[PDB]
Every structure is written in structure tokens, then in C-alpha cells.
């Protein structure tokens, strides 16, 4: 609809497409088997980002409360943009940057941002992989290292932290992070974190050495194993004392959380992380298919699987949350019972859940003075369920603690980390795809050098950038990318990708060119979303981000051993200078789309 001049001779034609495959068999990587393509998409869309952030987002807000908006926007906003990314990659036969520049030179900024966003999300994920494989390396010892504390200085008690906090808390915060007091208090490159980060980058380079002719062989173990281990954890998780309590807790969603703006804001941003939309990987992966591949079927299958896996993962994360919560509740009562049995010298087994409160007052009447001198913890179980996990805490504290309770603790622990490592590595394949290819298509390195040279330079580059997440304050540093800053650019790109393919390339052209490939011209559902419904939701929700998430003071939970209520999150405001850091990483890609366009409209004229 916008006044585009000479779009053709800048992109492939429809009559030429018949010679983009057999004629162009070389010069472009091609999926050996549709299976190999489907596993990559399944891996990429249903990896970390769909299986890591989702439960954390659901544990926060409300259990079932946050699930409703997510599944509304998953189809009303995610399915459209996923179909639009697959079809345009399959039609124009080029990667992200190439596709946007083909539609319009100014759109190059869209691909540039997509490359930066993909880089940053890989940098983030890699660290999570490094922590996963730290934990995976320690889980080959019958008594797992986070099931106890180091003896006191006089080998008497244990570290005040470990004593006042949990063994799992001490293994995470002290033995793994050696975390400092503040983001301001920068630490040192904890050598063992650096060493695991090196292992992470090393394995990823090995699996992505030679583009897609090395990752497609990897996704045979990397997109299957994670789903054949998450159905066993489901069974194990369901087979847990009090598991069915947390499961119901998840399906009991206060409706007043569904009527809060941030809840849905954290759902929309989450849609574009669940499906790796606006990283640009998907466009490239769909461009190596047959020109006559049914991409509508692929988008719907990927979306259904991606939607259904989100709920399957919150049913495994809650079974464990209700297991731990039930245990705490039981411990609270046991302790209470013991306290009253002590002093009063009640016969052991006399007082029980069945007769606590009546024997509280009874014994009170018998001897109030003594009963008065008796602390009594409050046990609720629902309050235990309501307890919200800290960032990354759920996987390295909640799950780790539950595993220790599980029999043959080392078997499960190992399996739990091998699942998280595999669905991380899978996710990283797409993340790396979306930074290698743009960098090839800028023609930045002399094209005599092989593909392996360029893939190692970015592995080492991002490896060197990842030293900041290896300091004492690194965890705080990593929790900044869990702020709105991370989602700021994604929303801009996704909207621009939709607007460019509908009001620049032309939806009419798109409808014809889609009809040429799959056979039929897309349904009314696809028309009503792409034209108005999809753009409106995306645009309105970014405006909401500007109004809620963006309009919030930056604060972060600090782990202060020397702090009143040490075993309690200390929420403090970020120092002003970290606004500079959020201005760049929210504003570099987001202003790249406008700011390369203006460059192309002041050089031409």
C-alpha cells in the first residue's frame, strides 16, 4: 500500500522460484529431511524461553491467572507472526537481513536489530547453560554437594549463612556465585564459573562449526532427549507427597490478577520469547525448505506443540512447588507439636495434626504461664504454595532441594540438568543462526575465509563479553536483562516485521505468493489478524510497556548475609549509572530500525 518503487529485480520472481532449488542446490544450505527442519523449529520455539521463563512468569503474578492471557495472545498475536516469518523466509529465499533489505533498503535496520537482539539473548542463555552445566558437573556424587554445609571454623556448626539460610541456598549463592553485596560491589572472574562458561561456548562452537550441516545432526539428540526426560519428571513430580496440592493451586487463579495490566504485558513479551520471533533465526531456517512446503501446517503444528508444552511444564513445576510447600507445612507442624510436647512432657505421639489446636488451649488451661512461654510457628501450606521463588532460584534451589529428597538423588539431578542443557543448546542453535548469517550477508570478513573462521570469532567474542556475568556481582548483571530492557526491542521489531510485510511489501502480493507455494490463498483468520488485530495488540501492548513496566523504578534482590532477615530478599533500587546500561541495550536495536532508515534517506537525497 505504501509507495514502493521497483520491488521486483530486488527480490526473486515467482516463475524463477522453479530454479531456486535444483538449479541452486549448492550456494545455499538445504534441510536434508523435513524431520531435521521440524526438530530445529521444535527445539528453537520449545527450548529455553518457552520452558525456562514461562514457569518463572507463572510462579510470579498468579499460577493459572497468567496462563489465560498467554494462550489468548499465543494465537491472536504469535501464530500470525510465526506464519508470516515462515512464509516470507520460504518465498524470498534469504535470511532475516536479506529479506528486510529486499522489501526496502531502509528495512535493513530491522535485520540489524534482529542480529543484535539474537546476540544479546544468546549471551544471556549461554550463562544459564554455564550454570546448568556447573550443576550438572557436581551431580556425580552419591550425597549431592548441595545436601549439606561446610563444618564451622571450629568444625562444629556450619557457615552462619548455611545455618541461617538453606544448604541449597549456600551452594547457589556462596559455593557457585560467591555473590557480592551489591551490583556496585564488582567482584572477580570466579575462575570455576569462567571455566564452565568456556565449556558452554566450546560445546556450542563444536555443534555449530559448519552452519546447519552440523546443527541438523545435533538436533536428533538435542530436540528429543529433553522431551523424553520432561515426561518422566512429570510422572515423578505427580508421584510426590503433596504434589496434587500445588497442581490444584496452579489451576486456582484469583481473577483479580487477570485484571492487572502488567500481567498481560508480561504475557505479550513472553509470546515473542516462547516462539523465537524477531531473533530472525526462523526466517533463515524456513528459507532452506522446498519452495512448495506447506508452512501454514508447520506454523500451526509448532504453535500447538509450543502452547501445549507451556502448560505441561507448569504442571511439572507446580507438582514440585506443592511437594516442597507440603513438606515445609508438615515440618512447621511437627516442630509446633514437638514444642508443646516438650516442657509439658506430653507422651510422644500424643499430640498430632488431628489434635493440635484443642491441646494448645487445653494445655494452656492446664498451665498458662508455661504455655505462654512457647513460640509456635504458623503452618498454612497454601501460604507455602503462595511463596514466590527468586530469579533462577526455582531451578537451582527449589528443584535441587526436591531432588535431594528424591531417592537415588544423583540419577535425577544428572537427568534434570541434561534436559536443561539439551533444550538450552537447541535454543542456542537458532540464537547463533540469527547472528552468523546477518554477519555473512554484511560481507564483513573476506569471503576466502571458511564459515568455521567467522563462527569461532563470534563464539570467542561473546565468550569475552560474558566475563561480566562471571564476577561476584555477575548475577545482578544477569538479572538486568530480565528487566523490561530485554523486551523493549523485541516488541518494536515484531511490530515492524508485521507492518513491513503488510503495508510495504503488500499483503495482496503476499496472499498471491503464498497461494503459489502451499496452493490455497490464506483464510479470513489470517486476513483479520495480519491486517488489523495482530498489529493493534502488538502496538497497544508496547504502549502499555511504556506505561507500566517502563514507568517502574529499577530494583534488584541482593543476598546480604550481614542483613536483618538475612534469609530474606533485600529489594533495593539500582544505582543511577545502571540506567545508562539499560538505555543502550533497550535503545541500540530499538533505535537501529529508525536510525538506519534516516541514514538511507539522507545519503540517497
Amino acid at each position: 500500500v505504501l509507495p514502493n518503487p521497483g520491488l521486483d529485480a530486488r527480490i526473486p520472481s515467482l516463475a524463477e522460484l522453479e530454479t531456486i532449488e535444483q538449479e541452486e542446490a549448492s550456494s545455499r544450505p538445504k534441510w536434508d529431511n523435513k524431520a531435521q527442519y521440524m526438530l530445529t523449529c521444535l527445539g528453537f520455539c520449545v527450548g529455553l524461553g518457552n520452558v525456562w521463563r514461562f514457569p518463572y512468569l507463572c510462579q510470579s503474578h498468579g499460577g493459572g491467572a497468567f496462563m489465560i492471557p498467554f494462550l489468548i495472545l499465543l494465537v491472536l498475536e504469535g501464530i500470525p507472526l510465526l506464519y508470516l516469518e515462515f512464509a516470507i523466509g520460504q518465498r524470498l529465499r534469504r535470511g532475516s537481513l536479506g529479506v528486510w533489505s529486499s522489501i526496502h533498503p531502509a528495512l535493513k535496520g530491522l535485520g540489524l536489530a534482529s542480529m543484535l537482539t539474537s546476540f544479546m539473548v544468546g549471551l544471556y542463555y549461554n550463562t544459564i547453560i554455564s550454570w546448568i552445566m556447573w550443576y550438572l558437573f557436581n551431580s556425580f556424587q552419591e550425597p549431592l554437594p548441595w545436601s549439606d554445609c561446610p563444618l564451622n571454623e571450629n568444625q562444629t556448626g556450619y557457615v552462619d549463612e548455611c545455618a541461617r539460610s538453606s544448604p541449597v541456598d549456600y551452594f547457589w549463592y556462596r559455593e557457585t556465585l560467591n555473590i557480592s553485596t551489591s551490583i556496585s560491589d564488582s567482584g572477580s572472574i570466579q575462575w570455576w564459573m569462567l571455566l564452565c562458561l568456556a565449556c558452554a561456548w566450546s560445546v556450542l562452537y563444536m555443534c555449530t562449526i559448519r552452519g546447519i550441516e552440523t546443527t541438523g545432526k545435533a538436533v536428533y539428540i538435542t530436540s528429543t532427549l529433553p522431551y523424553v526426560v520432561l515426561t518422566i519428571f512429570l510422572i515423578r513430580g505427580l508421584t510426590l507427597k503433596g504434589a496434587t496440592n500445588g497442581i490444584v493451586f496452579l489451576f486456582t487463579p484469583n481473577v483479580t490478577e487477570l485484571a492487572q495490566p502488567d500481567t498481560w504485558l508480561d504475557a505479550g513479551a513472553q509470546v515473542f520469547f516462547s516462539f523465537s520471533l524477531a531473533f530472525g533465526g526462523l526466517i533463515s531456517f524456513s528459507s532452506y525448505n522446498s519452495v512448495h512446503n506447506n508452512c501454514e501446517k508447520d506454523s500451526v503444528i509448532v504453535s500447538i506443540i509450543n502452547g501445549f508444552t507451556s502448560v505441561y511444564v507448569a504442571i511439572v513445576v507446580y507438582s514440585v512447588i506443592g511437594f516442597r510447600a507440603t513438606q515445609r507445612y508438615d515440618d512447621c507442624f511437627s516442630t509446633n507439636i514437638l514444642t508443646l510436647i516438650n516442657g509439658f512432657d506430653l507422651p510422644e505421639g500424643n499430640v498430632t495434626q488431628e489434635n493440635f489446636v484443642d491441646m494448645q488451649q487445653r494445655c494452656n488451661a492446664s498451665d498458662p504461664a508455661a504455655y505462654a512461654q512457647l513460640v509456635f510457628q504458623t503452618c498454612d501450606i497454601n501460604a507455602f504454595l503462595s511463596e514466590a521463588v527468586e530469579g533462577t532460584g526455582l531451578a537451582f534451589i527449589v528443584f535441587t532441594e526436591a531432588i535431594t529428597k528424591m531417592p537415588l538423588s544423583p540419577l535425577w539431578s544428572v537427568l534434570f540438568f541434561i534436559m536443561l542443557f539439551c533444550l538450552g543448546l537447541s535454543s542456542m542453535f537458532g540464537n547463533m543462526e540469527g547472528v552468523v548469517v546477518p554477519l555473512q550477508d554484511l560481507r564483513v570478513i573476506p569471503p576466502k575465509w571458511p564459515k568455521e573462521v567467522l563462527t569461532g570469532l563470534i563464539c570467542l567474542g561473546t565468550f569475552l563479553i560474558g566475563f561480566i556475568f562471571t564476577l561476584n556481582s555477575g548475577q545482578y548483571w544477569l538479572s538486568l536483562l530480565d528487566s523490561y530492557a530485554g523486551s523493549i526491542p523485541l516488541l518494536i521489531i515484531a511490530f515492524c516485521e508485521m507492518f513491513s510485510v503488510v503495508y510495504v511489501y503488500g499483503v495482496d502480493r503476499f496472499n498471491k505468493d503464498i497461494e503459489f507455494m502451499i496452493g490455497h490463498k490464506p483464510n479470513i483468520f489470517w486476513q483479520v489478524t495480519w491486517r488489523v488485530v495482530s498489529p493493534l495488540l502488538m502496538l497497544i501492548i508496547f504502549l502499555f510497556f511504556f506505561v507500566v513496566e517502563v514507568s517502574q523504578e529499577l530494583t534488584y534482590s541482593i543476598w546480604d548475609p550481614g542483613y536483618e532477615e538475612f534469609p530474606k530478599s533485600q529489594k533495593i533500587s539500582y544505582p543511577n549509572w545502571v540506567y545508562v546500561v539499560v538505555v543502550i541495550v533497550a535503545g541500540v536495536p530499538s533505535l537501529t530500525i529508525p536510525g538506519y532508515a534516516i541514514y538511507k534517506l539522507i545519503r540517497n537525497h
Binding site: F137, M206, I209
Partner: peptide, 29 residues
Amino acid sequence: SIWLIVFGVVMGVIVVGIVILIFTGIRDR
């Protein structure tokens, strides 16, 4: 350190694989 020896073995095998693949690439040349 058991964790440390596990780390060592894993990194060794991974670098061996990296070398094998760079060679596979040399063969492809």
C-alpha cells in the same frame, strides 16, 4: 575434585570433537 575431573573429561572430549570437525571441514575443502 570429582566435579573438577568430570569438567576436565567433558572439555577434553568436546575439544577432540571440535578438532575432528575442523578436519572434516578440511576434508570437505
